[PDB]
Structures are given as structure tokens and as C-alpha cells.
Design a protein around this ligand. Structure first.
Ligand SMILES: Nc1ncnc2c1ncn2[C@H]1C[C@H](O)[C@@H](COP(=O)(O)NP(=O)(O)OP(=O)(O)O)O1
Ligand SMILES: [Mg+2]
Ligand SMILES: [Mg+2]
Length: 430
DNA sequence: ATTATGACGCT
DNA sequence: AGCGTCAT
């Protein structure tokens, strides 16, 4: 009892931007603000593919992966913004630069781990300790947490007919219970972490004009889950004590890393649907079905416990460019293949050169991946070679050299390629 | 014809 | 080294 770890050692948050690519386009074009809007790529086929959707547009049922022509059927007044196109492919530079704006603000507060173009984990354990020392015995006011939800509250016994009324009542219950006394209560630490995350979210909105949501908990999985509970423009605190009720009706697929085959297996092999049901199995039983690492992870995670560290990494480990060639457009000639490789290499060269100037590093390996027609896998084949010069002509020529014997017969290229992907990796200081 | 592209585990 | 999974 006295010796059972409860996964309450850290304070971790996950900050994720709300409808991020849309906000980027709305900041730039004020006519799009506060309107049902989506961002699309490649307008020629079915009006383009939607990759981001404003919350006003979601209310009509518009979603990612939907065709714009189809989205317009659900939402006639839907406004659209097109992703920039360069060299015949989508160019996501505008969103990467916007991402940098936000990541640089978050880094001021604590160590972060970039997790995607629009989210990062934050390890607030040290910052909370410092803040706790800064205010001795200072009780925490509700005004310090104007956009925070406490998951699981309010509980027990009219302002609650509306959502802000629920939020405030739950926050009051939580704050009324908190003992400022006792610098080591995990709940107190989370609360101070939440205050700091309000400050962080305020700074991002002030300095970039972008709104975001956040989750604060004791580990990355719970912080990520918490982030999505009250999006948009709100933050949610998930305490250790909230986990049994929260996990009791939480579908297994909603937990990070369980959204694929492993999660399906868990459900299928154990005959359960919710994360909390995992507690009735022994660690050995879970290890026997899903392996040593997965079994141990599951046994601790269904109890709200996870030890994956927030890595101190702001910069991407790899830099890559890819393009799909669906259906009839699959590449069928040598020349075609070489031209598209050159287009990808030119974009890559730009991004690498910038990376070298900004971050004092150079990539040393080039990985080329291709997908052949009829193959469902992301990558049909991967090959690599040395990246010794940031030269687009050398890179595209070397990439062709490494995959040219994949061609069964021809001038002609077969089987046709439905994807080309160039990735620069193995960075070293410069 | 659900795209562009990341991190990282397994062998 | 090369492939498979899970992810936004
Ligand atoms: N499958 C995909 N393919 C291409 N781009 C994608 C993508 N999923 C996301 N993006 C791009 C476009 C997105 O804007 C961005 C962030 O991904 P989220 O955080 O998953 N989604 P958002 O921020 O939009 O809304 P909110 O978080 O409020 O739910 O990455
Ligand atoms: Mg987001
Ligand atoms: Mg995200």
C-alpha cells in the first residue's frame, strides 16, 4: 500500500491547436474568421480534399478526408482556403512556420516534446515546484483558471443547465477541496500546472492570435486524452482520482497507441470494450496475449499510470517530401519518375538548407520510398544512400540510382508507382 | 482517388 | 538495413 506507485510523480500537459490549419488561414484572411471554413488541397478532383475544418463547419457534419464538393452538400456556405502548391505538390511551409511560432512560445515556459505540427507535450514538474515555493500558502483563486475544466466534477447536488455553469461549479468543488497546505499533494501540483498552462495558452493566443486547448495530468497519455475532452479553446485537468470513472465507459480505441490493430486485438481477445475493464487481468495475462512491453504498459495504463518521459526535442528528427499518384495518374515512364524525384528533391533541398542555417545541423542519409500500384502499404520499398551534398540534382539522381532496378520492363516503368517519398535523416551537428 | 509526412518498434 | 504500426 505504502509501496504501490500511483503514477503521480510528474505534471505533464499536452497543448494542441484548435482547427490549426484553418486558424492559420483565418489569421491571414479576416474574411474567413468565425465562419464555417475548411482547408483543402488539390481543387481539381472533387473540389479538393479537406485536411482541416473549423468548428462552425463541424456543426454541419463536415470532416477531414471529405471531398470539398461533398462538404458543400452538407454546408452550402462553407468557405475554403487552398493549400499552397509548388512544383506540382502541396507545400505546407505556411503551417510549419506557424507551428514554429507556437513551439517557441511554449519552450519559454518548460521543456517540450514536439509531437506533431500542432501539439507538444510539456513537462511542468519543475515549474510547478518553483511556483509552489513562490507563493507560500497562497490559496488558488478560480480567476486563475478561467478556461479550466475539472474532469469528473461537479458531482452531487440551476446554473448547471448551461456549460459554463457546469464548468464553474466543478472548479469550485475542486478548489474548495484543495489543501494549499502540503506542497506535495499531487492534486495541488496538477492545479498549479493548470495555472501555468492557462498562462501559456494566454501567451500563445496573445502572441500569435491562435487559440488552443490543453490537457493537464500526470503523464502523456492522460494529458493527451484530457486535451480532447473540452475542445475548443478550453483546458481540462485529469486527476489520478478521476481515472476509474473516466475509464469505466471509455472505449479502448480512444487511448493513444490503441487506435489500431493492438487495440482491436485487446477488444477481440479479452472480450471487453472499455479501458477500465483491463484492471481485472493480471500483468502476466496481459503480457501473454500482447507481449512483454505491451502487457506491462496496458497493466499500468488502465490504472492511469504511464512512465514515458517527455523528451527534450523541439526539432524534427527527419525532413521529408512525398507525393501520391492515385489511380490512372500512377507513374508509368522512366522520365516521369525522374522528373517527380527532381521536384521532391528541390523542395527537400530548400527545407534542408534552411534547417542547416536555423539549427546548426546537417542530414547525412537519404531514404527513398515508393509505393507500387495495387499495394495497400504506405511503402512498398525503402532504399537509402549517403546524403553528402544539399544538391537537388545529386539527390534526385542518387534516389533514382537506388530504386531504378525496381523497374520490371520498358523507357517504360512498371509496375507503375503510386507514391514517391524522399526523407532526409541521421542529422549531425554542423 | 483518404494526402503529406512524422516517430519509432521489430527483426 | 528494411519493414510494420500508429499517429496528426
Ligand atoms: N490525416 C491528416 N492528413 C493531413 N493533414 C492532417 C491530418 N490530420 C491533421 N492534419 C493537419 C491539419 C490540421 O489542422 C493539423 C492538426 O491536426 P489535429 O490536431 O488533429 N486537428 P485540428 O488541429 O485541425 O483540429 P482540432 O485539434 O481542434 O481538433 O494537421
Ligand atoms: Mg489540433
Ligand atoms: Mg493535433
Amino acid at each position: 500500500g505504502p509501496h504501490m506507485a500511483t503514477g503521480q510523480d510528474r505534471v505533464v500537459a499536452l497543448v494542441d491547436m484548435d482547427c490549426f490549419f484553418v486558424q492559420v488561414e483565418q489569421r491571414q484572411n479576416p474574411h474567413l474568421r468565425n465562419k464555417p471554413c475548411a482547408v483543402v488541397q488539390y481543387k481539381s478532383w472533387k473540389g479538393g480534399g479537406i485536411i482541416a475544418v473549423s468548428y462552425e463547419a463541424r456543426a454541419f457534419g463536415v470532416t477531414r478526408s471529405m471531398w470539398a464538393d461533398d462538404a458543400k452538400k452538407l454546408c452550402p456556405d462553407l468557405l475554403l482556403a487552398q493549400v499552397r502548391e509548388s512544383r506540382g505538390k502541396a507545400n505546407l511551409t505556411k503551417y510549419r512556420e506557424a507551428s514554429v511560432e507556437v513551439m517557441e512560445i511554449m519552450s519559454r515556459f518548460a521543456v517540450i516534446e514536439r509531437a506533431s505540427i500542432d501539439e507538444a507535450y510539456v513537462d511542468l514538474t519543475s515549474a510547478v515546484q518553483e511556483r509552489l515555493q513562490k507563493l507560500q500558502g497562497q490559496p488558488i483563486s478560480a480567476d486563475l483558471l478561467p478556461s479550466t475544466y475539472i474532469e469528473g466534477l461537479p458531482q452531487g447536488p440551476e446554473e448547471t443547465v448551461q456549460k459554463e455553469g457546469m464548468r464553474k461549479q466543478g472548479l469550485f468543488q475542486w478548489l474548495d477541496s484543495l489543501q494549499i497546505d502540503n506542497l506535495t499533494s499531487p492534486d495541488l501540483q496538477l492545479t498549479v500546472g493548470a495555472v501555468i498552462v492557462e498562462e501559456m495558452r494566454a501567451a500563445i493566443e496573445r502572441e500569435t492570435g491562435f487559440q488552443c486547448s490543453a490537457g493537464i495530468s500526470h503523464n502523456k497519455v492522460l494529458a493527451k486524452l484530457a486535451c480532447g475532452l473540452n475542445k475548443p479553446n478550453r483546458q481540462t485537468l485529469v486527476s489520478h482520482g478521476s481515472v476509474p470513472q473516466l475509464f469505466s465507459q471509455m472505449p479502448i480505441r480512444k487511448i493513444r497507441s490503441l487506435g489500431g490493430k493492438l487495440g482491436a486485438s485487446v477488444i477481440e481477445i479479452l472480450g471487453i470494450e472499455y479501458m477500465g475493464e483491463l484492471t481485472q487481468f493480471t500483468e502476466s495475462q496481459l503480457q501473454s496475449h500482447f507481449g512483454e512491453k505491451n502487457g506491462s504498459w496496458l497493466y499500468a495504463m488502465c490504472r492511469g499510470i504511464e512512465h514515458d518521459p517527455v523528451k527534450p526535442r523541439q526539432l524534427p528528427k527527419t525532413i521529408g517530401c512525398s507525393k501520391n499518384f492515385p489511380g490512372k495518374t500512377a507513374l508509368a515512364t522512366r522520365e516521369q519518375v525522374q522528373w517527380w524525384l527532381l521536384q521532391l528533391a528541390q523542395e527537400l533541398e530548400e527545407r534542408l538548407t534552411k534547417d542547416r542555417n536555423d539549427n546548426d545541423r546537417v542530414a547525412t542519409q537519404l531514404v527513398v520510398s515508393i509505393r507500387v500500384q495495387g499495394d495497400k502499404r504506405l511503402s512498398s520499398l525503402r532504399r537509402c544512400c549517403a546524403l553528402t551534398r544539399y544538391d537537388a540534382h545529386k539527390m534526385s539522381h542518387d534516389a533514382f540510382t537506388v530504386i531504378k532496378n525496381c523497374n520490371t520492363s520498358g523507357t517504360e516503368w512498371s509496375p507503375p508507382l503510386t507514391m514517391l517519398f524522399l526523407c532526409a535523416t541521421k542529422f549531425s551537428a554542423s
